[PDB]
Subunit: 256 residues, 2 copies
């Protein structure tokens, strides 16, 4: 009754916590008078990447730091010089954030045993994905199919990439597929394609914690922070939420 499950990438099967991007931002400011925390790097949710770099420029404290190092406030020339460098570094460190999130390759092991096809979508461009897919593959993870915002007319809020997975995998009543993701947009994409949509919490971007940070942290503070992310997913489309991929099989059963 459920022939396919389509997974998201970073924050769902690869790059726990989703740090690759934050790493580049921190790097770029570091090469000069950095002083930037990964907490500041997650705030920027502007439209374009350049807008992100600009946002950090604007951020008081960071601005002040730049001034104490250069005796001047950041310039358009400066913003332009840094952004220009973002993509170079990104390609350089992606291989380091392409390892299965653990529990993953094991459920993908199953599911595939009981005849379920596995597809996927992403916000990453085709280029980026060639690199990521190869490292991830050469490490225990490789989906039956893959689609990017380049292979269709639009980005992710839209269902175009999901319909592609459908055709290529040969599964059709859309409600015979499940969408799993780590962010609010993942929920929307799924609801827009008429699929059962499930959101994962531990390891998501919505959570923001590191594999290591979660390890520690006050057990009562975690269960509070998890409860917040779960509420956001639901309020945005999720049909079901789960803490680790290891509850997926169970959810399927429920659906039937």
């Amino acid at each position: 009754k459920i022939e396919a499950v389509i997974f998201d990438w970073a924050g769902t099967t690869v790059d726990y916590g989703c740090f690759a991007p934050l790493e580049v931002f921190m790097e770029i400011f570091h090469k000069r008078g950095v002083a930037i925390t990964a907490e500041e790097a997650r705030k920027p949710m502007g439209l374009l990447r350049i807008d992100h770099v600009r946002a950090l420029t604007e951020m008081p404290r960071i601005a002040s730091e730049w001034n104490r190092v250069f005796r001047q406030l950041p310039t358009e020339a400066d913003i332009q010089e840094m952004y220009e460098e973002f993509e170079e570094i990104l390609f350089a460190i992606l291989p380091r954030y392409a390892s299965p999130i653990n529990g993953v390759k094991e459920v993908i092991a199953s599911l595939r045993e009981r005849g379920i096809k596995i597809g996927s979508t992403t916000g990453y461009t085709r280029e980026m994905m060639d690199i990521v897919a190869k490292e991830a593959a050469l490490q225990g993870y490789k989906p039956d199919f893959l689609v990017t915002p380049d292979d269709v007319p639009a980005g992710r809020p839209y269902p175009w990439m999901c319909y592609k997975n459908a055709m290529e995998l040969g599964v059709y009543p859309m409600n015979h597929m499940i969408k799993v993701g780590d962010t609010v947009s993942d929920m929307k994409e799924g609801r827009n394609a008429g699929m059962w949509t499930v959101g994962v919490i531990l390891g998501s971007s919505e959570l923001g914690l590191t594999e290591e940070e979660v390890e520690n942290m006050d057990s009562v503070e975690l269960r509070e922070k998890i409860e917040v992310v779960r509420n956001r997913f639901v309020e945005n489309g999720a049909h079901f939420t789960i803490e680790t991929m290891q509850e997926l099989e169970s959810v399927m059963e429920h659906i039937e």
Copy 2:
């Protein structure tokens, strides 16, 4: 609440009764010792076209006729020689069966006035369609989009061509679209894509009558034959049925 309507071609907007194919079959046997009625030409529902030609060969009466003309029963060589000719003639006469079914261009006139996008699918190949689309266009009918079994991994029972119309037209909750067709397979395709599916009766293939034959015929015999086709559509997926395109607007309203 309903942004798009996607129409079928032959039997829905073009070629009333859907005769182009029957014409070729009749032609091919005519060139020799024909004696074939358009009623016999509609029976063959085999897998391949060659299988259709073979079926007529097999048909007693037709077989007998061939024997009285050639003193021999049809040959593999013969079946092969005729089929080989089918596609040539088909291209030759398609222009003659590409005129709007009347009432059509007028509802397409409307609908489009109230902002509804019009897409379409077909069983016809890309080639055939270049010819048909041009004649139909140059006569009052031209949809916003067009898709064929060539532009996707599979034929019509599947929803692949419908999803294509969706992406290109930019309409997404599938249940915001209506599927209109003239056959049982049209109903299936629609139900498989999660759309509201409506079947038209007067002018369909399921009915089998000619614009002229319907004109005449015993008014009480028609209403009986219509009732039969309507029952077949429903038993196969139709959400609503209509006698002429001129009831479509009304059905939309009902849906809302």
